[PDB]
Ligand SMILES: Nc1nc2c(ncn2[C@@H]2O[C@H](COP(=O)(O)OP(=O)(O)CP(=O)(O)O)[C@@H](O)[C@H]2O)c(=O)[nH]1
């Protein structure tokens with residue numbers, strides 16, 4: 001089963017899930033074993049804090065159960081790591097708002113633009129009207145691409161001149177979305193990390209201005225991060241989380257990367273729902289995140 005997802009996690013499975021079998025085979029449970037396991041989790045980009053938690057709970061569970069063979073740790077690890085992802089297994093529900101405003105945050109180069117386009121198409125397939133806001137106002141090329149895409153796919157794009165105030169662009173977009181009975185408004189934002197302080201104050205301004213029109217907006221603050229960037233995805237998540245209230249995460253480029261274990265670090269460190277995972281370039285390759293599917297593909301024997 002899960003043949004499709006297993007293939008997309010092939011490189012990650014070398015170090016996590018089924019990758020543990022060869023590590024445990026024929027060994028006993030002792031300090032050396034747990035030190036080996038810790039190393040492999042760290043190599044898999046699981047993170048120091050989340051790895052220590054896994055080792056601590058795994059050590060205690062094996063001791064009180066009086067386990068002897070390392071192979072017996074496999075089931076406890078699947079449950080421990082499965083729980084981490086189950087805590088952030090909540091699909092995004094955009095129903096019942098006029099419009100549902102998704103504030104897309106993240107740095108450049110992690111797949112934010114692609115995710116906007118794929119989400120827009122998916123919502124249209126679900127019977128919804130979609131509108132986009134080009135809030136990345138100082139990157140003329142980024143604004144131009146989004147406008148070209150909207151005209152390709154017959155989706156309205158709200159944009160202003162290069163250098164316009166991003167909060168004002170998104171304000172006008174909410175007004176236009178409400179006036180045109182739009183179901184979902186997807187607002188792009190800047191992704192330049194030169195000067196953390198400024199970008200973060202820019203996002204807080206965008207949120208403040210939104211609530212002039214709708215105290216519920218933004219209904220979703222979605223971070224996009226790139227699984228192939230390893231711990232950079234975690235530092236980026238911490239940055240945007242502390243600055244603005246993240247409510248969802250999309251993790252792209254799980255396919256073809258050996259660093260897919262970062263998802264456990266992102267899940268455990270922040271507890272923010274992971275809404276989608278990217279496992280390909282097709283529109284449908286942006287899949288809703290299902291913790292059970294992911295664990296089963298990872299730990300399948
Ligand atoms: N293998 C893979 N590629 C993906 C995935 N999601 C997006 N991509 C691809 O990664 C590349 C970057 O996507 P993009 O949306 O442009 O990121 P960006 O931050 O907007 C780039 P810029 O800063 O110039 O605007 C693209 O080629 C995109 O098709 C994914 O889930 N898996």
Ligand SMILES: [Mg+2]
Nearest residue numbers: 031032035036
């Ligand atoms: Mg050792």
Ligand SMILES: [Mg+2]
Nearest residue numbers: 036037039040
């Ligand atoms: Mg080891």
Ligand SMILES: [Mg+2]
Nearest residue numbers: 112113142145
């Ligand atoms: Mg872009």
